[PDB]
Amino acid sequence: SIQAFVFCGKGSNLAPMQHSTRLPKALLPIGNRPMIEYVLDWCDQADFKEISVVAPVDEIELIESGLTSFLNSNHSHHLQDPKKINFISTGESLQKELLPRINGDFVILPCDFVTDIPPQVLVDQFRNRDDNNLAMTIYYKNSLKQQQFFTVYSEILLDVYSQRDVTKTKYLQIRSHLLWNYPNLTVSTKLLNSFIYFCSFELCQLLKLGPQSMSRQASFKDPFTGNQQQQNPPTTIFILPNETLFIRANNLNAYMDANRFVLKIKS
Amino acid sequence: EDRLQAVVLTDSYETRFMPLTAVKPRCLLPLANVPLIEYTLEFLAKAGVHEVFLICSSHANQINDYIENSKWNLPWSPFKITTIMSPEARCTGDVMRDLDNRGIITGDFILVSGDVLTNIDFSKMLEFHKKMHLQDKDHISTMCLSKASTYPKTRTIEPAAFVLDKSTSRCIYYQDLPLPSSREKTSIQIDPELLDNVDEFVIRNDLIDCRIDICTSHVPLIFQENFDYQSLRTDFVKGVISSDILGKHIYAYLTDEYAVRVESWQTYDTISQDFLGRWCYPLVLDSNIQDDQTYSYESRHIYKEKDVVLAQSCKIGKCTAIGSGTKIGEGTKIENSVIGRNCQIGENIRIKNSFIWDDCIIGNNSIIDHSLIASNATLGSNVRLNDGCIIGFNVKIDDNMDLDRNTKISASPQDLDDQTLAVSIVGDKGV
Amino acid sequence: TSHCRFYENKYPEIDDIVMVNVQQIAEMGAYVKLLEYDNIEGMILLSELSRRSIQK
Amino acid sequence: PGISSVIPTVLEQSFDNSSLISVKELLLNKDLIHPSILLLTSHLAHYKIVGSIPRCIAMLEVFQIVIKDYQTPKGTTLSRNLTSYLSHQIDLLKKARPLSVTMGNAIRWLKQEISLIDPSTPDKAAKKDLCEKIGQFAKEKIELADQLIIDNASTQIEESTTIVTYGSSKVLTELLLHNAISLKKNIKVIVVDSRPLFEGRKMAETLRNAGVNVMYALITSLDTIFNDVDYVFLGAHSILSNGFLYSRAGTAMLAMSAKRRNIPVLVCCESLKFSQRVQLDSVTFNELADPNDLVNIDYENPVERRGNKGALLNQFIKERKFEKKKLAMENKPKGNKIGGKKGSEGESKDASNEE
Can you spell out the DSSP letters for B139-186? EEEEEEEEE-SS-TTS--S----EEE-SSS-----------SS-----
Query: Which is it for the CA torsion D206, D211, D216, D222, positive or negative?
Result: negative
CA distance, residue C56 to nearest chain D CA (Å)? 6
Cα separation of A137 and A152, whole Å? 10
C3 vs D: CB within 8 A? no
Q: Provide, as residue numbers in chain A, all residues whose Cβ is less than 8 Å from the Cβ of B152.
A: 180, 183
Cα separation of D273 and D271, whole Å? 6
CA distance, residue D306 to nearest chain A CA (Å)? 15
Interface mutation target, options A103, A128, A244, chain D, most CBs of D under 10 Å: A128
Q: Contact at 8 Å (CB) between B46 and B122?
A: yes
CA dihedral angle for residue A6, residue A153, residue A47, residue A139, rounded to 10 degrees:
70
Instruction: Give residue D306's region: left, alpha or beta (phi > 0; psi -120 to 50).
Output: beta
Q: In chain A, what are the domain boundaries?
A: 1-267
Q: Provide, as residue numbers in chain D, all residues whose Cβ is less than 8 Å from the Cβ of C23.
A: none
Q: How are beta strands A133-138 and B139-147 bridged, if at all?
A: unpaired
Q: How many CB atoms lie within 10 A of CB B166?
A: 11
B281 vs A: CB within 8 A? no
- No. of helices (H) and no. of strands (E), chain A: 7, 13
The continuous run of DSSP H or E covering A27 comes out as none
Q: Contact at 8 Å (CB) between D311 and D318?
A: yes
Supply angle C-alpha A10, A14, A15, rounded to 5. Answer: 130
Q: Three-state DSSP class for D326?
A: strand
Measure CB to CB from residue D29 to each of A1, A47, A128 and give the nearest one.
A47
Chains C and A touch (3+ CB pairs under 8 A): no
CA distances from A2 to A49, A105, A140, D165 (A): 7, 6, 32, 43
Q: What are phi and psi of B132, to 5 degrees?
A: -65, -40
Cα separation of B242 and A210, whole Å? 45
Q: How many CB atoms lie within 10 A of CB B326?
A: 20
Measure CB to CB from residue D27 to each of A1, A49, A120 and give the nearest one.
A120
Query: Which is it for the CA torsion C7, C12, C16, C21, positive or negative?
Result: positive
Sheet holding B320-322: strands in order across? B295-297, B302-305, B320-322, B338-339
D83 vs B: CB within 8 A? no
Beta bridge partners of A133: A199, A241
Burial label, B140 (beta-carbon count in 10 A; 0-12, 13-18, 19+): buried
Cα separation of A115 and A248, whole Å? 9
Query: Which is it for the CA torsion B342, B348, B352, B354, positive or negative?
Result: negative
Measure CB to CB from residue A189 to each of B188, B201, B205 and give the nearest one.
B201
Query: Which is it for the CA torsion B49, B51, B55, B61, positive or negative?
Result: positive
Q: What are phi and psi of B297, to 5 degrees?
A: -75, 135
Q: Is there a contact between A127 and D28 if contact means CB atoms under 8 Å apart?
A: no
Q: Is there a contact between D225 and B318 if contact means CB atoms under 8 Å apart?
A: no
Q: Which residue pairs, CB below 8 angstroms and at least 24 apart, start in B347-356?
A: B351/B317, B355/B269, B355/B272
Q: Provide, as residue numbers in chain B, all residues whose Cβ is less than 8 Å from the Cβ of D190.
A: none
Last residue before each gap in chain B (C to N over 2.5 A): 413
D279 vs A: CB within 8 A? no
Q: What are phi and psi of B344, to 5 degrees?
A: -90, 125
Nearest CA among A48, A105, A114 for reference residue A246: A114
DSSP assignment of B293-312 equals --EEE-STTEEEESS-EE-S
Q: Where are the alpha helices (DSSP H) in chain D?
A: 35-45, 53-69, 82-96, 101-116, 123-138, 145-156, 170-180, 199-210, 223-226, 252-260, 350-354
D224 vs B: CB within 8 A? yes
Supply angle C-alpha D52, D54, D55, rounded to 5. Answer: 65
Cα separation of B355 and B31, whole Å? 10
Cα separation of B113 and B89, whole Å? 15
CA dihedral angle for residue D103, residue D104, residue D106, residue D111, rounded to 10 degrees:
140
CA distance, residue D152 to nearest chain C CA (Å)? 13
Nearest CA among A236, A69, C25, A12 for reference residue D151: C25
Cα separation of B267 and B155, whole Å? 7
State the DSSP code for D201. Answer: H
Cα separation of A223 and A219, whole Å? 6
CA distances from A176 to A156, A230, B102 (A): 22, 15, 45
How many C-alpha atoms does B361 have within 13 Å on its Cβ side? Answer: 8
Locate the chain B residue with the closest alpha carbon to D217: B300
Cα separation of A196 and A122, whole Å? 10
Task: State which residues form the domain around B115.
Answer: 5-276
Cα separation of D330 and D348, whole Å? 10
List the 290-319 stretch of D: residues with Cβ below 8 A of A: 302
D76 vs B: CB within 8 A? no
Q: Is there a contact between B206 and A176 if contact means CB atoms under 8 Å apart?
A: no
Q: Is there a contact between B187 and A173 if contact means CB atoms under 8 Å apart?
A: yes
Nearest CA among D200, D262, D280 for reference residue D234: D200
A53 CA to centre of own chain? 14
Residues of A with CB under 8 A from a CB of D: 1-2, 47, 49, 120-121, 124, 127-128, 155
Cα separation of B340 and B334, whole Å? 14
Cα separation of D258 and D328, whole Å? 12
Cα separation of B99 and D292, whole Å? 58
Q: Is there a contact between A1 and D302 if contact means CB atoms under 8 Å apart?
A: no
Q: How are beta strands B212-215 and B109-113 bridged, if at all?
A: antiparallel
Cα separation of B216 and B218, whole Å? 6
Interface mutation target, options B278, B302, B318, B333, chain D, most CBs of D under 10 Å: B318
Locate the chain B residue with the closest alpha carbon to D224: B299
Q: How many CB atoms lie within 10 A of CB D166?
A: 27
Length of chain D: 355
Nearest CA among A30, A35, A2, A5 for reference residue A17: A30
Q: Provide, as residue numbers in chain B, all residues whose Cβ is less than 8 Å from the Cβ of A189.
A: 195-196, 199-201
Q: Contact at 8 Å (CB) between A203 and A241?
A: no
Cα separation of B332 and B346, whole Å? 10
CA dihedral angle for residue D236, residue D237, residue D240, residue D242, rounded to 10 degrees:
-30
Cα separation of D355 and D346, whole Å? 18
Cα separation of A151 and A184, whole Å? 10
Q: Contact at 8 Å (CB) between B320 and B336?
A: yes
CA distances from D73 to B215, D76, D79, D88, D295 (A): 82, 6, 11, 19, 51
Q: Contact at 8 Å (CB) between A240 and A234?
A: no
Nearest CA among D12, D9, D15, D11 for reference residue D325: D15
Q: How are beta strands B338-339 and B5-9 bridged, if at all?
A: unpaired
Length of chain C: 56
CA distances from A47 to A58, A120, D26, D27, D282 (A): 30, 9, 9, 8, 42
Q: Contact at 8 Å (CB) between D204 and D164?
A: no
Query: Which is it for the CA torsion B276, B281, B287, B288, positive or negative?
Result: negative
Interface mutation target, options B154, B203, B256, chain A, most CBs of A under 10 Å: B203
| Resolution as reported, in Å | 10.1
Q: Is there a contact between B299 and D224 if contact means CB atoms under 8 Å apart?
A: yes
Q: Which residue pairs, CB below 8 angstroms and at least 24 apart, start in D5-14?
A: D8/D312, D8/D313, D9/D290, D9/D291, D9/D312, D9/D313, D10/D313, D10/D319, D12/D319, D12/D321, D14/D321
CA dihedral angle for residue B155, residue B158, residue B159, residue B161, rounded to 10 degrees:
-130
Measure CB to CB from residue A128 to each of D27, D28, D42 and give the nearest one.
D42
Q: Name the method of structure determination.
A: cryo-EM
Nearest CA among B115, B150, B92, B126 for reference residue B259: B115
Nearest CA among A222, A177, A165 for reference residue B187: A177
| Strand ranges inside B287-395, DSSP E | 295-297, 302-305, 309-310, 315-316, 320-322, 327-328, 333-334, 338-339, 344-352, 355-356, 361-369, 371-373, 378-385, 389-391
Interface mutation target, options A161, A186, A245, chain B, most CBs of B under 10 Å: A186
What is the domain-level CATH number for residue B219? 3.90.550.10
Q: Is there a contact between B299 and D213 if contact means CB atoms under 8 Å apart?
A: no
Measure CB to CB from residue B203 to each of A145, A173, A185 and give the nearest one.
A185
b (16+ CB within 10 A) / e for A116-140: ebebeebbeebbeeebbbbbbbbbe
CA distance, residue C42 to nearest chain D CA (Å)? 24
Q: Provide, as residue numbers in chain D, all residues whose Cβ is less than 8 Å from the Cβ of C55.
A: 339
Q: Provide, as residue numbers in chain D, all residues whose Cβ is less than 8 Å from the Cβ of A103.
A: none
Chains B and A touch (3+ CB pairs under 8 A): yes
Supply angle C-alpha A6, A11, A14, rounded to 5. Answer: 130
Beta bridge partners of A29: A34
Beta bridge partners of B327: B309, B344
Beta bridge partners of A188: A150
Instruction: Give residue B300's region: left, alpha or beta (phi > 0; psi -120 to 50).
Output: left
